[PDB]
Design a protein around this ligand. Structure first.
Ligand code: PI
Ligand code: PI
Ligand code: NA
Length: 213
């Protein structure tokens, strides 16, 4: 099968049903063994948890999904009354992500919207009754981080204190996205570099907190 199908199969064969921690560990172990992604829990999961704990969002928007690791990671921390919206253009990735959340017992915490963010973001207010977002997680399509961010602003979906957290921001990648959020007085920025036990960056994340237009 595809890599995402194989990740799901592994979780289904090895993880404890209804146990988000077990699901995350199964994905992490498998991806590390395959050398597809090293210790994602230490490299990005702990940082995601810290951001969610710091800001305590009621409404999180995830832009992009692959196998559902990130959706499980975030959704497991959301209390009653809080929820995750996940947008992903690839229906195969959306499908795996749905099955992964189902396995973790987290389906009622998340709505998956299948389509291009360009098309869906402008529908959030009128179609999905959103006013503003508390947090945005930018997950996988780094060439879309800047245009997604500008569209969120254009649509009036960011408010003062909304936190954007972008994964896989490792120099010299995403130079335009970083120059934009750092250069703009509308964002307060923090960069995280995860080295695990060695000398080279394994994953990098940018936190950008909206300060208003
Ligand atoms: O795999 P993910 O976490 O969905 O990106
Ligand atoms: O590169 P870094 O982020 O400085 O460590
Ligand atoms: Na800035």
């Amino acid at each position: 099968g595809t890599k995402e199908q194989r990740i799901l199969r592994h979780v289904q064969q090895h993880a404890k049903p209804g146990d988000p921690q077990s699901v995350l560990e199964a994905i992490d172990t498998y991806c590390s063994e395959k050398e597809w992604a090293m210790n994602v829990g230490d490299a990005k999961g702990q940082i995601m948890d810290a951001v969610i704990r710091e800001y305590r969002p009621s409404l999180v928007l995830e832009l992009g999904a692959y196998c559902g690791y990130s959706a499980v990671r975030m959704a497991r921390l959301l209390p009653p009354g809080a929820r995750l919206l996940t947008m992903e253009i690839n229906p195969d990735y959306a499908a795996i992500t749905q099955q992964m959340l189902d396995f973790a017992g987290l389906q009622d915490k998340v709505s998956i919207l299948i389509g291009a963010p360009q098309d869906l973001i402008p529908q959030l207010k009128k179609k999905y009754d959103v006013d503003t977002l508390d947090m945005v997680f930018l997950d996988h399509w780094k060439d879309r981080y800047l245009p997604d961010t500008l569209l969120l602003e254009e649509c009036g979906l960011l408010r003062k204190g909304t936190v954007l957290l972008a994964d896989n921001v490792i120099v010299p990648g995403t130079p335009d996205f970083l120059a934009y959020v750092r250069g703009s007085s509308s964002f307060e920025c923090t960069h995280y570099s995860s080295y695990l036990e060695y000398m080279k960056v394994v994953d990098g994340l940018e936190k950008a907190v909206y300060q208003g237009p």
